[PDB]
Amino acid sequence: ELHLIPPLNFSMVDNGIFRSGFPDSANFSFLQTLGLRSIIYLCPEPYPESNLQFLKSNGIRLFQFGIEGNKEPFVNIPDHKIRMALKVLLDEKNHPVLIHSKRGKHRTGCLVGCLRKLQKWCLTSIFDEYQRFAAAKARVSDQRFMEIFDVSSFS
């Protein structure tokens, strides 16, 4: 067809950094326009064959840091997996990079919020951006994780 279709909840976060929910084949022509080097994938489920073939054909590296898709109020975001994903984001060699989960609201929102903390954003600005994507599914647990996340080791 004649039009591009960004994936669910697509946004540019920064120079060379994007966020979304799970891309499907209708989104591949749009993703090709970004010249991605990397995908940071935050779900534990195996990457579907369709997505794997797109990744391979397009020369994109897959980084998988599987965070269990927990529902409130029993959400347990591993600090370690967010820290390893931030290390990938902070290396310009991996850019352009797309961060995605299933809908790009919770696991993706936490990783982006922790990056904003490293960029010295005030918490209210971090939460406002998180809530723009999470909307009616904004979780206190996601924001509490960002509130407590320690930026000592990086900064």
Ligand SMILES: O=P(O)(O)O[C@@H]1[C@@H](OP(=O)(O)OP(=O)(O)O)[C@H](OP(=O)(O)O)[C@@H](OP(=O)(O)O)[C@@H](O)[C@H]1OP(=O)(O)O
């Ligand atoms: O287990 P997940 O976290 O991978 O999936 C949850 C979705 O979480 P999701 O997988 O989207 O998380 P992320 O990809 O991290 O946003 C969430 O979707 P949403 O809250 O809209 O993001 C949805 O909400 P619904 O569509 O309103 O019924 C449900 O909470 C759903 O939990 P499940 O129904 O037990 O699989």
